[PDB]
Amino acid sequence: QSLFSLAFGVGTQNRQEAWLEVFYALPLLKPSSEIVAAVAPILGYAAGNQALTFTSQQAYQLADALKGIDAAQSALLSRLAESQKPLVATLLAEDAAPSSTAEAYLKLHLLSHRLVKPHAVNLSGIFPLLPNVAWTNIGAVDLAELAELQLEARLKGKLLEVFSVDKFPKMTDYVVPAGVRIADTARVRLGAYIGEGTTVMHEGFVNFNAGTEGPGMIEGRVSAGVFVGKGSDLGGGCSTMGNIVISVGEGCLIGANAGIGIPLGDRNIVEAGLYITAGTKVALLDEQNALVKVVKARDLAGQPDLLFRRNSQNGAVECKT
Amino acid sequence: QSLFSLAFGVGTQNRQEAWLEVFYALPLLKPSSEIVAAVAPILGYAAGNQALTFTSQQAYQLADALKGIDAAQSALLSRLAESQKPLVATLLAEDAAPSSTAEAYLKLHLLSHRLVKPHAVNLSGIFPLLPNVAWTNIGAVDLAELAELQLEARLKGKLLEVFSVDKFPKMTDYVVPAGVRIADTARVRLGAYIGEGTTVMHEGFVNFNAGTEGPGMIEGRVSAGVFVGKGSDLGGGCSTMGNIVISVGEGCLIGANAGIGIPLGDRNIVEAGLYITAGTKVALLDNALVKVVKARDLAGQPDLLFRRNSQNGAVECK
Amino acid sequence: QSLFSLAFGVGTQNRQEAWLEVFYALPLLKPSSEIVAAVAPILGYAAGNQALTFTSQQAYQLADALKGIDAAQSALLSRLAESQKPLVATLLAEDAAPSSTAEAYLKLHLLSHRLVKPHAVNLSGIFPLLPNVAWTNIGAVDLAELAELQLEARLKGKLLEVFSVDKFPKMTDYVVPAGVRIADTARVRLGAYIGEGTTVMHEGFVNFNAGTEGPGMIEGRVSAGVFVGKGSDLGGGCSTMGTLNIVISVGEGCLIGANAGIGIPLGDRNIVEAGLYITAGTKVALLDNALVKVVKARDLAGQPDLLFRRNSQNGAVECKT
Ligand SMILES: N[C@H](CCCCC(=O)O)C(=O)O
Ligand SMILES: N[C@H](CCCCC(=O)O)C(=O)O
Ligand SMILES: N[C@H](CCCCC(=O)O)C(=O)O
Numbered sequence: 001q002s003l004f005s006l007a008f009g010v011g012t013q014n015r016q017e018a019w020l021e022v023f024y025a026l027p028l029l030k031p032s033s034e035i036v037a038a039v040a041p042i043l044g045y046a047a048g049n050q051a052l053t054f055t056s057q058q059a060y061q062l063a064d065a066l067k068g069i070d071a072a073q074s075a076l077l078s079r080l081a082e083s084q085k086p087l088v089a090t091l092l093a094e095d096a097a098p099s100s101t102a103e104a105y106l107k108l109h110l111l112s113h114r115l116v117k118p119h120a121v122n123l124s125g126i127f128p129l130l131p132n133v134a135w136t137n138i139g140a141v142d143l144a145e146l147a148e149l150q151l152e153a154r155l156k157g158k159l160l161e162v163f164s165v166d167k168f169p170k171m172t173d174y175v176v177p178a179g180v181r182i183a184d185t186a187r188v189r190l191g192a193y194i195g196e197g198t199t200v201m202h203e204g205f206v207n208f209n210a211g212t213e214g215p216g217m218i219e220g221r222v223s224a225g226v227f228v229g230k231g232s233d234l235g236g237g238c239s240t241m242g243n244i245v246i247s248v249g250e251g252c253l254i255g256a257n258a259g260i261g262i263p264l265g266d267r268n269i270v271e272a273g274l275y276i277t278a279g280t281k282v283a284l285l286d287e288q289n290a291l292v293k294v295v296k297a298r299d300l301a302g303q304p305d306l307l308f309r310r311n312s313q314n315g316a317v318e319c320k321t
Numbered sequence: 322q323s324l325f326s327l328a329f330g331v332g333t334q335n336r337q338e339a340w341l342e343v344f345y346a347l348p349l350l351k352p353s354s355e356i357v358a359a360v361a362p363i364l365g366y367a368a369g370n371q372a373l374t375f376t377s378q379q380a381y382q383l384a385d386a387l388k389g390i391d392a393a394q395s396a397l398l399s400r401l402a403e404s405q406k407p408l409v410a411t412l413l414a415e416d417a418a419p420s421s422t423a424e425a426y427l428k429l430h431l432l433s434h435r436l437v438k439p440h441a442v443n444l445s446g447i448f449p450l451l452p453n454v455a456w457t458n459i460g461a462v463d464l465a466e467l468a469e470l471q472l473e474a475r476l477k478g479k480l481l482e483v484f485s486v487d488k489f490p491k492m493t494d495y496v497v498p499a500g501v502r503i504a505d506t507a508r509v510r511l512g513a514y515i516g517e518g519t520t521v522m523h524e525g526f527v528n529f530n531a532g533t534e535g536p537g538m539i540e541g542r543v544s545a546g547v548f549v550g551k552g553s554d555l556g557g558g559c560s561t562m563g564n565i566v567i568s569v570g571e572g573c574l575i576g577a578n579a580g581i582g583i584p585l586g587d588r589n590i591v592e593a594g595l596y597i598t599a600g601t602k603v604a605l606l607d608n609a610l611v612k613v614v615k616a617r618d619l620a621g622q623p624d625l626l627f628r629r630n631s632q633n634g635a636v637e638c639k
Numbered sequence: 640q641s642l643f644s645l646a647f648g649v650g651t652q653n654r655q656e657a658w659l660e661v662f663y664a665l666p667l668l669k670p671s672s673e674i675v676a677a678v679a680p681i682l683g684y685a686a687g688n689q690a691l692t693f694t695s696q697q698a699y700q701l702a703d704a705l706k707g708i709d710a711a712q713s714a715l716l717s718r719l720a721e722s723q724k725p726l727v728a729t730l731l732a733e734d735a736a737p738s739s740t741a742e743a744y745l746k747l748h749l750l751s752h753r754l755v756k757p758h759a760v761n762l763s764g765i766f767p768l769l770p771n772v773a774w775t776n777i778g779a780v781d782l783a784e785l786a787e788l789q790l791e792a793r794l795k796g797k798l799l800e801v802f803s804v805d806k807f808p809k810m811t812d813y814v815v816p817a818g819v820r821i822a823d824t825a826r827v828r829l830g831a832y833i834g835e836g837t838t839v840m841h842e843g844f845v846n847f848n849a850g851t852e853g854p855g856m857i858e859g860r861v862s863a864g865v866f867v868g869k870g871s872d873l874g875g876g877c878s879t880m881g882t883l884n885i886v887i888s889v890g891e892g893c894l895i896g897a898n899a900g901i902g903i904p905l906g907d908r909n910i911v912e913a914g915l916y917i918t919a920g921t922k923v924a925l926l927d928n929a930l931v932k933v934v935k936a937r938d939l940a941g942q943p944d945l946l947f948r949r950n951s952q953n954g955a956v957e958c959k960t
Contacts (some may be wrong), residue, residue, distance in 0.1 A: 315954015
């Protein structure tokens, strides 16, 4: 059948050969049968979703079997035949719940390489499949083995820097897509879709399965599953929430430290320092600022051209059209 | 006497022999008399709270002394004996206001290894004992010597990365306690207590002498001296203040960008985007009115639900 | 003429000889005619604003020329003479809109070395002269060359760390000014002015062409073009508005509470309540605490000794003189 995805990965394993992470230089959405027929008899692949650990010799086999077909995947596999780490040709048949850390890592590479957009990928059950790892300057270190390597570094007058301890690495250690700025790459997880013309400032955050159409100025927090449409501005410290799936529309402006708990339609504005939730009651207005009625914000969710603001004289949350 | 604490460290000194930081691989709280008796003669330790420098040769002597007493300390000493960096043995008879840089570091270590909890140790006058230090990829660097090292790196087409300039280092370059998540480790100082099951996200922060029993999802700012009970939450970008001892009870929820200037009791609730302090007047409820009181008075009461009324801007509590 | 500035730099170039960044150890504001006379012939410098590449051999000639005029610059040039990286000598007759990457970098160096203050240097058109770059543990890497290197690191079992993708690098990687703490150096850009006796906590942020006179605790976000006067405080997570209209500045001895936000220039000894956000149009209940009139915040901008606050019983935004 027509594969969902395939990728030749180079990862790291804990002392017991359990995977900690895997790097995928050039992952493919819907590979071609000519690439797949070449490698398929080599991987000992038959069908399904398989994470097939393979050898340095086979890397030379594959590099050859792709001479003529897909030079980049071929040139990728030449390089991988020199690899000091272990290899995992991962081949998915369907967009299905991951059944491996190694497939989990492939699937996060698709969002980040922009090969798929948020929610175009099954990330049901993924958390159990991502070992909580020490992210350090030498790479991935298993939590059980850390203190050891920390001490040895100190003896040699050196430092083993531990810059995150989480089940997600930061995206940029695997991929920086085109036209992107990220001031503090600690703040953007792998699995984030950062669209062309997006500038994530130091105060911005972007979770896995979440992000920006591009362009956009993100100075606030983009929660898991949230998507921000083109032309939008998230101000400093502003919050989105992670039931209902929060989204932001096109040309929206969210002021500094504002909070949104409802979907914002296109060309929406939210005043700095205003937190709106689904249950928050809002004093609706008309083309003037005469009252029309009071309503719950949930019932304004998705509406275009709204201006949410706090009346400073009576503490009333207003909305203008 | 029975020692409060002891630990064998490897640290860094500046050209003028002043200590910048100390790394303690296995600090001991209430070390047995057997260990102390084996180690005191070699160190020159008689009494009190002391940061005693010791030599590569003394490391071998100590290693042998602790064979048949404590294997783990004996093995550390064997590693230590091979060090390229100066060694210090910190023996504290009592828990008192620190009297050295090495002692201060040891006491931050006791918190971050979870051997003691926030407020359990005397940290009075710690600030002067913790030199402001450039934290870099090669290790700790003295501010007076940094600009020269920065230059030399660029000549070799290398970078001397200066990722913090402060008196406290980040915790995880010394210690990662069990069952712990920290999204961005710049955000947790050495001296923070990070309880098992706690996951600290990118916007979460924890100061020294503060932290979490665990579990918890910390996405906000736990100031110095603030402890947060089991199963409590601190949503994105919230804040706690660091006079009156601020804490958070068990099973509590705190909203995003909210701010607590009072000690919240068990199972308390604060609204997202809602800041309260000890002087902010709140409308108490039963939601019929009872009386307008200052949040300082409710401080400690369990099972509350703080909120801001979206029509009249009134701060309320139920 | 008298030069506005000159500086000798060692920098990084991409494959096509384009500058990615320049490091200046000892930049000079208003350098002597004696220093400029020694170097102008050797560099081929006549006039104008120039960034002239010079050779390792020219470095020796410059070093020799400056023995007896300026020893430190001579001492730097002898170091630069041995360097593994390209050199550039930036000489600027006038403080004007940058015309090269090397010049743009110098001006940010002039700011972060405290040789000039925010708004004392012409920074117009600086975004297009600052190339977007990957800031890694091996230095600056061109975005076009990154993926190849990210691959090679994994194959040697190492990690090329990408800690920022941006047009501005973090300041402390170039210069740490005396008498300063910065908890998380990610949050202070090159071009920041961090006055003596400033602490920037982890949640603090200082953009280029902004900063602090000193002393002061900055736990909140100082935007581009904002200068905070001596002895003032910015609490955890607070906000200033930038202009990227009217330039926002904070006066001396001011207090700004956690999560609060300023959209007006605050005069001396001003105070703002924690969690309170004010803008130019925000209508405020002015007091003496007996009412006087409900006026726009813009008319108070710059006034000394004010105390802005939110009335917790009726939501009213006030200001007690
Ligand atoms: N605010 C939520 C936090 C959810 C934590 C995600 C994790 O467990 O690593 C979000 O941004 O999605
Ligand atoms: N409680 C802390 C205060 C900031 C610490 C400042 C210092 O280390 O000199 C906080 O607001 O998180
Ligand atoms: N809030 C604004 C952000 C300015 C844009 C940041 C950039 O494109 O380098 C400020 O700090 O002034």
